[PDB]
């Protein structure tokens, strides 16, 4: 029944989640702001994300940035990622089925079953990974995006991005209330902005008190500035992903979020097809034979049959009742045999 239940779109969601966080990592590392550690001016990068909608379309910086972002996403072990994710998933589902099954007790038999599933998946893992990289070989070169795929990526990016924003804003406001007044954290933020510009200098690796702020309050102010900049960037990229300019597919370099999400979805689905065939069906075919062989060998080789019986409370009372009855019957049999061997 489980094998009839699992199927392939489940593998689709499983792969798409791992690749979703792959997208967030690549996009954030290529486009968004980096953390503040000290109170020195940060080296100012010439191009900024706030001026992306109003940027020259033939920009070598933005082109190189989106291109190295996408090539980094594609030339990753997506074959090995899909194979290991599907492996852990199938094994987990077998473990849950085991939880609901009659083998809740008997950890020996249960572990025999689990280890059987594990060894089958381990046997097939390599063929699935290499086959997935071969089948993805054309989409590594040109993951050409269709307008509907672009629309799907558009709808998905809004949700992924706003979840990131909500966590960010909740953390900011909690920071304000923890430090004290909103206006007080605004004061430390103004001071850290001042030291980040040329307006003021502190010359400390560990600044204790400057402008009246503690060594901890400075840390809280830097954290506040980072959260601010990341929140503004995130909201701006959400409004851009909802922008009119990102609805069309031709502005691929102008909408890195939507493009990278589209590539993620595509690689996930075509890798998922070969994954289902090469791995999933192989599991459904090999698993029962392996279970039967290993369980039978376990009971009869290890003597775990009798312990398997001893383990459950109801069946222990059942078989114990049967045993004492057996001893008495055999005693009567010995007496009846005695009467036969000796006429009188």
């Amino acid at each position: 029944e489980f094998a009839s239940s699992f199927g392939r779109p489940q593998l689709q969601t499983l792969l798409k989640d791992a690749l979703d966080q792959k997208v967030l990592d690549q996009l954030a590392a290529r486009y968004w702001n980096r953390p503040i550690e000290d109170l020195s001016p940060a080296p100012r990068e010439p191009d900024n994300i706030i001026d992306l909608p109003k940027a020259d379309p033939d920009s070598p910086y933005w082109h190189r940035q989106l291109d190295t972002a996408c090539s980094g996403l594609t030339r990753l072990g997506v074959g090995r990622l899909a194979a290991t994710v599907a492996a852990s998933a199938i094994q987990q589902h077998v473990e849950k089925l085991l939880d609901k099954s009659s083998f809740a007790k008997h950890p020996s038999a249960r572990k025999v079953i689990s280890d059987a599933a594990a060894t089958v998946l381990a046997d097939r893992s390599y063929a699935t990974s290499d086959g997935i990289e071969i089948s993805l070989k054309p989409y590594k070169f040109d993951p050409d995006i269709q307008p509907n795929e672009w629309a799907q990526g558009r709808e998905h990016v809004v949700g992924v991005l706003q979840a990131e924003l909500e966590q960010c804003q909740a953390a900011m406001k909690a920071l304000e209330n923890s430090v004290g007044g909103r206006k007080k954290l605004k004061e430390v933020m103004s001071f850290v902005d001042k030291a980040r510009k040329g307006e003021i200098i502190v010359e400390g690796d560990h600044p204790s008190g400057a402008g009246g702020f503690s060594a901890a309050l400075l840390a809280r102010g830097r954290e506040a500035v980072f959260l601010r900049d990341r929140a503004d960037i995130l909201s701006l990229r959400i409004q851009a992903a909802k922008s009119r300019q990102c609805k069309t597919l031709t502005n691929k370099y102008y909408c890195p979020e939507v493009f990278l999400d589209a590539v993620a979805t595509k690689l996930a689905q075509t890798a998922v097809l070969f994954l289902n065939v090469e791995m999933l069906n192989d599991f459904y075919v090999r698993f029962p034979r392996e279970v039967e062989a290993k369980l039978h060998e376990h009971m009869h080789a290890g003597g775990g049959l009798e312990k398997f019986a001893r383990e459950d409370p109801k069946v222990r009372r059942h078989l114990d009742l049967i045993r004492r009855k057996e001893l008495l019957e055999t005693v009567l049999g010995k007496i009846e045999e005695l009467h036969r061997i000796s006429s009188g």
Partner: protein, 50 residues
């Protein structure tokens, strides 16, 4: 030496394997030589000049 030979051999096979995997996933096992790069780029330049 002969005793360590087995473990060392398997480890060398391992470091060879991961070098091979990266050669498969990132460059598609495409052969490359300096002369090939130079010749291809020269012809690209000559297409540009033509």
């Amino acid at each position: 030496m002969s005793s360590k030979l087995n473990e060392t051999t398997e480890a060398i096979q391992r470091e060879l394997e991961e070098t091979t995997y990266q050669f498969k996933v990132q460059y598609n096992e495409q052969p490359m030589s300096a002369e090939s790069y130079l010749a291809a780029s020269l012809d690209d330049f000559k297409h540009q000049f033509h």
